[PDB]
Write an enzyme that holds these catalytic residues in place. Sequence first.
Site, PDB file in Angstrom:
ATOM      1  N   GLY A 122       0.479  -0.835  -0.327  1.00  0.00           N
ATOM      2  CA  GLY A 122       0.043  -0.021  -0.159  1.00  0.00           C
ATOM      3  C   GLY A 122       0.995   1.367  -0.390  1.00  0.00           C
ATOM      4  O   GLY A 122       1.328   1.480   1.512  1.00  0.00           O
TER       5      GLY A 122
ATOM      6  N   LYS B  71      -1.888   5.673  -4.597  1.00  0.00           N
ATOM      7  CA  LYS B  71      -2.657   5.844  -5.958  1.00  0.00           C
ATOM      8  C   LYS B  71      -1.733   5.302  -7.431  1.00  0.00           C
ATOM      9  O   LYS B  71      -2.130   4.722  -8.285  1.00  0.00           O
ATOM     10  CB  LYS B  71      -3.550   6.123  -6.617  1.00  0.00           C
ATOM     11  CG  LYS B  71      -4.789   6.864  -5.295  1.00  0.00           C
ATOM     12  CD  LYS B  71      -5.034   7.583  -5.087  1.00  0.00           C
ATOM     13  CE  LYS B  71      -6.054   8.648  -3.664  1.00  0.00           C
ATOM     14  NZ  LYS B  71      -5.795   9.490  -3.388  1.00  0.00           N
ATOM     15  N   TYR B  72      -0.706   5.783  -7.457  1.00  0.00           N
ATOM     16  CA  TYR B  72       0.393   6.059  -8.581  1.00  0.00           C
ATOM     17  C   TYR B  72       1.551   5.182  -7.989  1.00  0.00           C
ATOM     18  O   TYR B  72       1.288   4.941  -9.322  1.00  0.00           O
ATOM     19  CB  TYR B  72       1.235   7.157  -7.805  1.00  0.00           C
ATOM     20  CG  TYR B  72       0.128   8.704  -8.552  1.00  0.00           C
ATOM     21  CD1 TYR B  72      -0.897   9.489  -7.798  1.00  0.00           C
ATOM     22  CD2 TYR B  72       0.971  10.096  -9.754  1.00  0.00           C
ATOM     23  CE1 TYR B  72      -1.187  10.333  -8.996  1.00  0.00           C
ATOM     24  CE2 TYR B  72       0.176  10.722 -10.047  1.00  0.00           C
ATOM     25  CZ  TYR B  72      -1.008  11.137  -9.747  1.00  0.00           C
ATOM     26  OH  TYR B  72      -1.448  12.331 -10.354  1.00  0.00           O
ATOM     27  N   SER B  73       1.555   4.765  -7.373  1.00  0.00           N
ATOM     28  CA  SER B  73       2.999   3.440  -7.516  1.00  0.00           C
ATOM     29  C   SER B  73       3.119   2.037  -7.345  1.00  0.00           C
ATOM     30  O   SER B  73       1.431   1.937  -6.985  1.00  0.00           O
ATOM     31  CB  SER B  73       3.562   4.268  -5.922  1.00  0.00           C
ATOM     32  OG  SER B  73       3.275   5.415  -5.362  1.00  0.00           O
ATOM     33  N   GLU B  74       3.784   1.380  -7.866  1.00  0.00           N
ATOM     34  CA  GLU B  74       3.452   0.379  -7.677  1.00  0.00           C
ATOM     35  C   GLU B  74       5.085  -0.983  -7.331  1.00  0.00           C
ATOM     36  O   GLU B  74       5.967  -0.345  -7.906  1.00  0.00           O
ATOM     37  CB  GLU B  74       3.451  -0.114  -9.275  1.00  0.00           C
ATOM     38  CG  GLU B  74       1.987   0.439  -9.875  1.00  0.00           C
ATOM     39  CD  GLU B  74       1.806  -0.745 -11.552  1.00  0.00           C
ATOM     40  OE1 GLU B  74       1.694  -0.822 -12.362  1.00  0.00           O
ATOM     41  OE2 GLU B  74       0.781  -1.403 -11.153  1.00  0.00           O
ATOM     42  N   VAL B  75       5.032  -0.177  -5.697  1.00  0.00           N
ATOM     43  CA  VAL B  75       5.951  -1.517  -5.216  1.00  0.00           C
ATOM     44  C   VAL B  75       4.874  -3.059  -4.370  1.00  0.00           C
ATOM     45  O   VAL B  75       3.405  -2.994  -3.815  1.00  0.00           O
ATOM     46  CB  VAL B  75       6.011  -0.922  -4.269  1.00  0.00           C
ATOM     47  CG1 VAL B  75       7.520  -0.984  -3.401  1.00  0.00           C
ATOM     48  CG2 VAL B  75       7.021   0.641  -5.152  1.00  0.00           C
TER      49      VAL B  75
ATOM     50  N   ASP C 212      12.774  15.121  -2.085  1.00  0.00           N
ATOM     51  CA  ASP C 212      11.949  14.174  -1.430  1.00  0.00           C
ATOM     52  C   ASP C 212      11.637  13.873   0.059  1.00  0.00           C
ATOM     53  O   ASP C 212      11.664  12.269   0.099  1.00  0.00           O
ATOM     54  CB  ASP C 212      11.353  13.852  -2.401  1.00  0.00           C
ATOM     55  CG  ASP C 212      10.186  12.953  -2.611  1.00  0.00           C
ATOM     56  OD1 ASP C 212       9.047  13.826  -2.028  1.00  0.00           O
ATOM     57  OD2 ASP C 212       9.243  12.118  -3.132  1.00  0.00           O
TER      58      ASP C 212
HETATM   59 BR1  NKB Z   1      12.526  -1.207   0.016  1.00  0.00          BR
HETATM   60  C1  NKB Z   1      12.084   0.285  -1.175  1.00  0.00           C
HETATM   61  C2  NKB Z   1      12.723   1.686  -2.410  1.00  0.00           C
HETATM   62  C3  NKB Z   1      11.907   1.821  -2.687  1.00  0.00           C
HETATM   63  N1  NKB Z   1      12.680   3.521  -3.918  1.00  0.00           N
HETATM   64  N2  NKB Z   1      11.348   4.152  -3.647  1.00  0.00           N
HETATM   65  N3  NKB Z   1      10.096   3.588  -3.365  1.00  0.00           N
HETATM   66  C4  NKB Z   1      10.104   2.299  -2.206  1.00  0.00           C
HETATM   67  C5  NKB Z   1       9.836   1.806  -1.411  1.00  0.00           C
HETATM   68 BR2  NKB Z   1       8.113   2.197  -1.529  1.00  0.00          BR
HETATM   69  C6  NKB Z   1      10.215   0.662  -0.575  1.00  0.00           C
HETATM   70 BR3  NKB Z   1       9.581  -0.370   0.348  1.00  0.00          BR
END
Ligand code: NKB
Length: 333
Positions: free
Chosen positions: A45, A48-52, A155
């Site tokens: 989680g 809306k924007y991110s894909e992790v 950031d």
């Molecule tokens: Br590990 C890790 C590295 C990342 N780099 N950009 N966003 C990240 C996130 Br969310 C994680 Br969790």
Amino acid sequence: SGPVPSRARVYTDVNTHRPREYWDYESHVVEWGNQDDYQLVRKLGRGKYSEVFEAINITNNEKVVVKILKPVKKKKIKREIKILENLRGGPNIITLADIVKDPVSRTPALVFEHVNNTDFKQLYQTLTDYDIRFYMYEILKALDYCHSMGIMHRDVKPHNVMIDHEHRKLRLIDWGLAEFYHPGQEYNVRVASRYFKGPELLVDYQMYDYSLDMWSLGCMLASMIFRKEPFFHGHDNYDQLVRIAKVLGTEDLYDYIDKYNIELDPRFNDILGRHSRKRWERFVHSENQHLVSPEALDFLDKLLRYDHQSRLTAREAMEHPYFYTVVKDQARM
Ligand SMILES: Brc1cc2nn[nH]c2c(Br)c1Br
Ligand SMILES: [Cl-]
Ligand SMILES: [Cl-]
Ligand code: NA
């Protein structure tokens, strides 16, 4: 005449003294791995924007984090890779483990050392005084390191600090907006989240440096010791400077504008008004007074300055009396 030029007070020329290859990320050649070495377990989680994703490296059965790089300029992908490679092994810096593409979609992805998806924002309104000092010092280790390596994060915010509170471990993540510092370079001011944006971004002063991160850090500290999230609560980027002006005062703002010969957007003409610099005691109440000390306020005051040159460096910040007990306990441990 145009704006008055500015230089970083510290680590000014570190990229100049490096081989071109260190900072010339546009010329970096990536050896793209096979994302099929990994199996995705679950989506973290991150809004809306991110894909992790949490994932498993099939080969060694080790847990990793996979970040799928949403369609973007290849230039920005090479920048984030080069910065992560340059900072790999630095204190409290996330570790890049692999760089892969899906064989079918060809979409680029970054593979990191596993960290739990427990960000500082989830924890930082519930800490003891000692733990605020402890985690602040751990963030400073990461910032002094990346600044010393010629990189500004741009950031710094609680969502980009992953904490394992059980093991008292912290990582600075999401280097997607990070940039190499070059003296005299004019940077994009459309970086950082609204509440963490330094005055340089809000008045469109482009010749900024590592000190941008120290403003963001001050915003985090103010939020934590005063239990006020966010500390500077603007409706938009114009109102954001008004919220700052009502605390830091308009006298120091106009002196900053005059010092760097900044052309202020005309929309600021009617909204900034005239404000005294407020004493920090004004933000202290019965539910935050246990987190506020003379040491905390002296330290915060030295981070939150209009004039980026005036702000503590990361190393100066680490040397402040606010951290004396953290430093002593670290040496002892
Ligand atoms: Br590990 C890790 C590295 C990342 N780099 N950009 N966003 C990240 C996130 Br969310 C994680 Br969790
Ligand atoms: Cl945040
Ligand atoms: Cl006052
Ligand atoms: Na107190």
